[PDB]
Write an enzyme that holds these catalytic residues in place. Structure first.
Site, mmCIF file in Angstrom:
data_model
loop_
_atom_site.group_PDB
_atom_site.id
_atom_site.type_symbol
_atom_site.label_atom_id
_atom_site.label_comp_id
_atom_site.label_asym_id
_atom_site.label_seq_id
_atom_site.Cartn_x
_atom_site.Cartn_y
_atom_site.Cartn_z
ATOM 1 C CG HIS A 58 52.048 78.896 77.419
ATOM 2 N ND1 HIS A 58 52.273 78.973 76.060
ATOM 3 C CD2 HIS A 58 51.755 80.154 77.825
ATOM 4 C CE1 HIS A 58 52.115 80.223 75.663
ATOM 5 N NE2 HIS A 58 51.810 80.960 76.716
ATOM 6 C CE1 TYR A 100 56.590 73.551 70.990
ATOM 7 C CE2 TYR A 100 55.509 72.299 72.738
ATOM 8 C CZ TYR A 100 55.461 73.279 71.757
ATOM 9 O OH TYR A 100 54.279 73.968 71.572
HETATM 10 N N1 LIG Z 1 48.284 74.603 63.072
HETATM 11 C C1 LIG Z 1 48.774 74.739 64.317
HETATM 12 N N2 LIG Z 1 48.361 75.773 65.114
HETATM 13 C C2 LIG Z 1 48.863 75.887 66.382
HETATM 14 C C3 LIG Z 1 49.850 74.911 66.864
HETATM 15 N N3 LIG Z 1 50.180 75.257 68.105
HETATM 16 C C4 LIG Z 1 49.487 76.368 68.414
HETATM 17 N N4 LIG Z 1 48.709 76.734 67.384
HETATM 18 C C5 LIG Z 1 47.790 77.879 67.365
HETATM 19 O O1 LIG Z 1 48.411 79.086 67.783
HETATM 20 C C6 LIG Z 1 47.353 79.943 68.207
HETATM 21 C C7 LIG Z 1 47.848 80.904 69.289
HETATM 22 O O2 LIG Z 1 48.346 80.236 70.449
HETATM 23 P P1 LIG Z 1 48.353 80.987 71.890
HETATM 24 O O3 LIG Z 1 48.631 82.470 71.652
HETATM 25 O O4 LIG Z 1 49.257 80.175 72.800
HETATM 26 O O5 LIG Z 1 46.854 80.755 72.491
HETATM 27 P P2 LIG Z 1 45.448 81.541 72.210
HETATM 28 O O6 LIG Z 1 45.798 82.941 71.708
HETATM 29 O O7 LIG Z 1 44.694 81.531 73.538
HETATM 30 O O8 LIG Z 1 44.784 80.655 71.177
HETATM 31 C C8 LIG Z 1 46.179 79.044 68.626
HETATM 32 O O9 LIG Z 1 44.998 79.327 67.855
HETATM 33 C C9 LIG Z 1 46.670 77.634 68.367
HETATM 34 O O10 LIG Z 1 45.693 76.706 67.853
HETATM 35 C C10 LIG Z 1 50.235 73.843 65.924
HETATM 36 O O11 LIG Z 1 51.059 72.984 66.238
HETATM 37 N N5 LIG Z 1 49.678 73.811 64.713
#
Ligand SMILES: Nc1nc2c(ncn2[C@@H]2O[C@H](COP(=O)(O)OP(=O)(O)O)[C@@H](O)[C@H]2O)c(=O)[nH]1
Ligand SMILES: Nc1nc2c(ncn2[C@@H]2O[C@H](COP(=O)(O)OP(=O)(O)O)[C@@H](O)[C@H]2O)c(=O)[nH]1
Lengths: 177, 178
Positions: free
Chosen positions: B68, B135
């Site tokens: 990422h 991080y």
């Molecule tokens: N509440 C919260 N949700 C998070 C955070 N970081 C990532 N997410 C959520 O984790 C989910 C999955 O992340 P990812 O699999 O990388 O991306 P996606 O599947 O394309 O949304 C996403 O809906 C993000 O909003 C955070 O710090 N806090």
């Protein structure tokens, strides 16, 4: 997406319980512990969170009770479990030397904000624990010589700990005498 | 009072990537250390950009997350419990090391924070039973969530990362990139 529930303690004025949201699935959990945008308003203007620390401790270790005149602390446990105990060490407070316990489990995220002149302590109830805290203060870091120490078992405070025989540093032992 | 210290080394192979090694006080109770101060570490990112966002990822054994990145976010990454294979990928198309990578095996025995500039690929693999990944993010303006980030496949043959397994546990995002 990123959110924080912020509640003031019902026992100790000025102490706040911050609960983040998370994305949880079977692979694990991802969450935001702090942003400047949402949480810098917990400390007065001009004072910035600028210092991140970790304490890895073993089962039955107790650290405390520690504080200083100028440092705000945002504390939690990101692995294992601690009995976090906040003590009101403000001499001008009507709840002077009262305390509040939060059992903070890495599975249930809870960050506690302590203003200055508060006693910070915790006891490790899991096999290992990782304790994360952010510090906000002006000027130089207040190391051990510039901090105060109350005994973990001070009868005037009367904290209810899970043991009478914790593992203590020599500093924390010295305060019992 | 044992003073707070940071050793700071630039990667010998990916320009702009830094390995930050804190000191620790170790005793029979465990360990205490400082992961960041503004005084010592804000100079790793250019002026006007502040570390203003702290995140944690609790993951199980054999979980791989990545690769990422985004155009504007600096990342200071480490593992504060357990062990990860942290892999940084150069995703800067101008760079003479474009799509090369560097691995850091990070745990408390080798406490090591890695600074990634923008347009870099961030990934890690959990080699312990559980791990906690910490991080800090530095960026101007709004947070770049998943839709505003790029994704390279964990096993992209053009990158050729040496992972400890061919069968990691992956999110649906990280599978989609295959
Ligand atoms: N509440 C919260 N949700 C998070 C955070 N970081 C990532 N997410 C959520 O984790 C989910 C999955 O992340 P990812 O699999 O990388 O991306 P996606 O599947 O394309 O949304 C996403 O809906 C993000 O909003 C955070 O710090 N806090
Ligand atoms: N390297 C390092 N040492 C620290 C840090 N925080 C506290 N210490 C040191 O840890 C030691 C132990 O603290 P403690 O047992 O509570 O107090 P002491 O018994 O009076 O030293 C002290 O020497 C502190 O200076 C840190 O972030 N990094």
């Amino acid at each position: 997406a990123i959110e924080f529930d912020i509640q003031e303690s019902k026992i100790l004025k000025g102490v706040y319980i911050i609960t983040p949201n998370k994305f949880r699935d079977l692979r694990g959990e991802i969450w935001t512990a702090f942003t400047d945008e949402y949480l810098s308003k917990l400390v007065p203007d001009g004072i910035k969170f600028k210092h991140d620390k970790f304490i890895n401790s073993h089962f039955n270790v107790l650290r405390g009770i520690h504080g200083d005149v100028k440092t705000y602390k945002l504390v939690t446990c990101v692995y294992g479990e601690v009995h976090q105990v906040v003590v009101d060490c403000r001499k001008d407070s009507p709840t002077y030397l009262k305390w509040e316990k939060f059992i903070i489990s890495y599975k249930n995220q809870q960050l506690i904000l302590l203003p200055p002149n508060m006693g910070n302590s915790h006891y490790v109830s899991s096999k290992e624990a990782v304790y994360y805290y952010k510090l906000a203060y002006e000027g130089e870091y207040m190391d051990a010589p510039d901090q105060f120490t109350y005994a973990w078992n001070d009868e005037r405070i009367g904290i209810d700990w899970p043991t009478n025989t914790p593992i203590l540093s020599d500093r924390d032992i010295l305060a019992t005498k």
